[PDB]
């Protein structure tokens, strides 16, 4: 079929449980991409439908701060996802390496993340799984764009309609409404943006505990600090945006649109 004949495979960039990703060239254009090659023979019916939902949802998104899915091909014993080639690794790795971001860099970073989330929301997509591991740097270059990835847990929403879409995501980044088993939607991503922004500024999260029961109590109670000394030098408008994202009532939580107008971002 059309993958082997339209795309030329080059070296392995990474691997997962049931996938290998290789650099490839669309021979006609000579443009390079990342080909995620999935052995569908080793996938359950459930994983197979997850994959085809992920492919559908990601294809809705066309934004410089989202890892673009250009093509989806279902051949003999394989599924090929053709993505933007990204060579800068995870935002998680960059934060670890640099300890934390200056307010300038943190503001620049979360602005890009909010633009990606806003685009998702305008396309009727809620990610549900925002975290530093799911944000990739386009390159190792100085001012490389942050790109949102992994729509494996993303859902399609009907305008502003909320519903119970199930208990799904990463414990440390789960919104209070999901933990409360409340109907939810777009606001869940803005909670995760708050957790990410907090991490960018001091290099550690607002909610953590070895005991998951106690972690979920902290999140539901919205019990987070700005400890001294590291937060003492952090500007109050930075703390204000975090506070406006980490509100336990999603109806009172700042949206992606409103967040991008917030002084700390719009005056930077």
């Amino acid at each position: 079929t059309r993958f082997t004949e339209e795309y030329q495979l080059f070296e392995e960039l990474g691997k997962g449980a049931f996938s290998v990703v290789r650099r490839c060239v669309k021979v006609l254009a000579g443009q390079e991409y990342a080909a995620k090659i999935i052995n569908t023979k080793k996938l359950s019916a459930r994983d197979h439908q997850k994959l085809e939902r992920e492919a559908r949802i990601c294809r809705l998104l066309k934004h410089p701060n989202i890892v673009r899915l250009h093509d989806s091909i279902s051949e003999e014993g394989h599924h090929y996802l053709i993505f933007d080639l990204v060579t800068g690794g995870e935002l998680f790795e960059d934060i670890v390496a640099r300890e934390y971001y200056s307010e300038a860099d943190a503001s620049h970073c979360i602005q890009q993340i909010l633009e990606a989330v806003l685009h998702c929301h305008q396309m009727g997509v809620v990610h549900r799984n925002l975290k530093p591991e799911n944000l990739l740097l386009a390159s190792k270059l100085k001012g490389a764009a942050v790109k949102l990835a992994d729509f494996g847990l993303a859902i399609e929403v009907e305008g502003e309609q909320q519903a119970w879409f199930g208990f799904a995501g990463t414990p440390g980044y789960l919104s209070p409404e999901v933990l409360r088993k409340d109907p939810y939607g777009k606001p869940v991503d803005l909670w995760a943006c708050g957790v990410i922004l907090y991490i960018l500024l001091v290099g550690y999260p607002p909610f953590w505990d070895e005991d998951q029961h106690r972690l979920y109590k902290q999140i539901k109670a919205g019990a987070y600090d700005f400890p001294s000394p590291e937060w003492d030098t952090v500007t109050p408008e930075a703390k204000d945006l975090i506070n406006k994202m980490l509100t336990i009532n999603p109806s009172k939580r700042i949206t992606a649109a409103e967040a991008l107008k917030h002084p700390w971002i719009s005056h930077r």
């Binding site: 998680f92 934060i95 670890v96 992994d150 847990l153 414990p171 550690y204 607002p206 909610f207 953590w208």
Partner: peptide
Amino acid sequence: RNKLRRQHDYDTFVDL
């Protein structure tokens, strides 16, 4: 302080 660790995605409620 709180630990910055890699965390895994769950598709359902799994009580840890």
